[PDB]
């Protein structure tokens, strides 16, 4: 489940990913283009990959 697609949706949208309009960042690591590449870097980023859904969770958590 996750996601990466609306993931890198929310956060392009909220703040997670990086990007200089076509290719996307990381806090940390370039993720790839938007995408050809936006959650690739977030497919096997399992390290911070819940980091990605949580940064958008928490960023209005406790809203």
């Given at each position: ?57 928490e960023l209005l958590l406790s809203n």
């Amino acid at each position: 489940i996750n996601f990466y697609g609306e993931l890198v949706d929310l956060g392009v949208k909220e703040k997670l990913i990086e990007k200089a309009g076509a290719w996307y960042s990381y806090k940390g690591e370039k993720i790839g283009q938007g995408k050809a590449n936006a959650t690739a870097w977030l497919k096997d980023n399992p390290e911070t990959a819940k980091e990605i859904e949580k940064k958008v969770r928490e960023l209005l958590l406790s809203n």
